[PDB]
């Protein structure tokens, strides 16, 4: 559901 | 090309880095929510600032005032005075993670962009939002002011790069170009300091170079290499070179006019997230999974 969390 | 490493911080993952204009300091904003201030001449942690919950992706010094700005996954844009060592105020307004924040080189503005699909411009003296640029249909991963013209370039997971006319230095903003070419999300964009060129970096493992006229814009060429997402890219300010950094654990240098590979620098086990250049010196910094490196090239 969210991306680019790193 | 040779890398002359001047300083390495060892830490948990770093996301953003900012060079002070006159002192030998960098701010490094961390995934753990802390902001570190390092003296890279001595290798000392001068201070640490705690004012966000979660990652701090955006970080930037003001060019002349003792201020820095930070932007976080808590959606806040924070303005700090590093001399008094105080958080001055928070610009809340964004409705999802902040990906970038920076000061304008002349006007009292802060630029930020966000997963909420907007780019926002704030006046830091009046502490209000003066512009909200809409149009992207997914996260805005990067936005930057042009150094001499009233333009902003932005990059989005919607697979586009946009150039915006900001007008309204004195509606406020209109999209001038929409650049399509990347087959996947775009993570970063940059203006060349003097030529009408733009660089972008994507989840397609590519760095692309684009050129602008007064009326048109198109893709020039592609830097091929990288074997994972390209996190960041920039133009070398003093040589005809392109720099990029990637989750494939490399920083790569390419010729600007040919896009041929010049040099690849690797780390054994650290993804790269961000690269920046000192606003006055030939000095570069890169953020990765294990900290930040500050270096010169040849």
User: What would the DSSP string read from start to end of B79-99?
Assistant: EEETTTTEEEEEE---SS-EE
Query: For residue B120, what are its two tokens?
Result: 């926002």
Give the domain ranges of chain B. 1-298
Neighbours of B118 (CB within 10 A): 22
Contact B141 A6 (CB under 8 A): no
Q: Is A2 on the interface with B (CB under 8 A)?
A: yes
- Say which residue the tokens 């003093």 belong to: B238
Task: Read off the tokens for B190.
Answer: 């940059």
Q: Which helix (H) or strand (E) holds B57?
A: strand B56-61
Give the integer Cα–Cα distance in Å for B207 and B243.
Answer: 9
B31 close to A (CB below 8 A): yes
Experimental determination approach used = X-ray
Cα B241 vs. chain centroid, distance in angstroms? 18
Distances (CA, A) of B287 to B13, B29, B271, B275: 8, 9, 9, 6
CA B237 to CA B55: how far, in whole Å? 29
Within 8 A of A4 by CB-CB distance, chain B residues are 115, 139, 141, 157, 187
Listing from the earlier edge strand, what are the strands of the sheet with B140-145?
B140-145, B151-156, B160-165, B174-180
Looking at the complex, report in whole angstroms how far the Cα of residue A1 sits from the nearest Cα belonging to chain B.
Answer: 12
Q: Do B115 and A2 touch (CB under 8 A)?
A: yes
Name the CATH superfamily housing domain B1-298: YVTN repeat-like/Quinoprotein amine dehydrogenase (2.130.10.10)
Does B139 contact A at CB distance below 8 Å? yes
**Cβ contact, residue pair A4, B157, below 8 Å:** yes
Count the Cβ atoms, other than its own, within 10 Å of residue B214: 6
> Coil, helix or strand for B53?
coil
> Does residue B271 sit at the A interface (CB-CB below 8 Å)?
yes
- The long-range contacts involving A1-6, CB below 8 angstroms and separated by at least 24 positions, are A2/B97, A2/B115, A3/B139, A3/B157, A4/B115, A4/B139, A4/B141, A4/B157, A4/B187, A6/B13, A6/B31, A6/B271, A6/B273
- A1/B contact by beta carbon, under 8 A: no
Q: With CB atoms and an 8 Å threshold, state whether B139 touches A4.
A: yes
Residue B13 contacts A, CB cutoff 8 Å: yes
């Amino acid at each position: 559901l969210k991306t680019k969390l790193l | 090309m040779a890398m002359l490493t001047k300083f390495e911080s060892r830490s948990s993952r770093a996301k953003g880095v900012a060079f002070h204009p006159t002192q030998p300091w960098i701010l490094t904003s961390l995934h753990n929510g802390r902001i570190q201030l390092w003296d890279y001449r001595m290798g000392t942690l001068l201070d640490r600032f705690d004012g966000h919950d979660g990652p701090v992706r955006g970080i930037a010094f003001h060019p002349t005032q003792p201020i820095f700005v930070s932007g976080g996954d808590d959606y806040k844009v924070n303005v700090w005075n590093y001399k008094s060592r105080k958080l001055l105020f928070s610009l809340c307004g964004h409705m999802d993670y902040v990906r970038v924040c920076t000061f304008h080189h002349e006007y009292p503005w802060i630029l930020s962009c966000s997963d909420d699909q907007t780019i926002r411009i704030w006046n830091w003296q009046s502490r209000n939002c003066i512009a909200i640029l809409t149009g992207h249909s997914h996260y805005v991963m990067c936005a930057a002011f042009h150094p001499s013209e009233d333009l902003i370039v932005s990059a989005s997971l919607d697979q586009t790069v946009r150039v915006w006319d900001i007008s309204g230095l004195r509606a406020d903003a209109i999209v001038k170009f929409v650049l399509e070419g990347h087959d996947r999300g775009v993570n970063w964009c940059a203006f060349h300091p003097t030529l009408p060129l733009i660089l972008s970096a994507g989840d397609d493992r590519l760095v692309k170079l684009w050129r602008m006229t007064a009326s048109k814009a198109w893709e020039v060429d592609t830097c091929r290499g990288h074997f994972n997402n390209v996190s960041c890219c920039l133009f070398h300010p003093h040589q005809e070179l392109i720099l990029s950094a990637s989750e494939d654990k490399t920083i790569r240098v390419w010729d600007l006019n040919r896009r041929t590979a010049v040099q690849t620098f690797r780390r054994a086990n650290d993804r790269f997230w961000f690269i920046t250049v000192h606003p006055k010196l030939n000095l570069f910094a890169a953020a990765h999974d294990s900290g930040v490196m500050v270096f010169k090239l040849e």
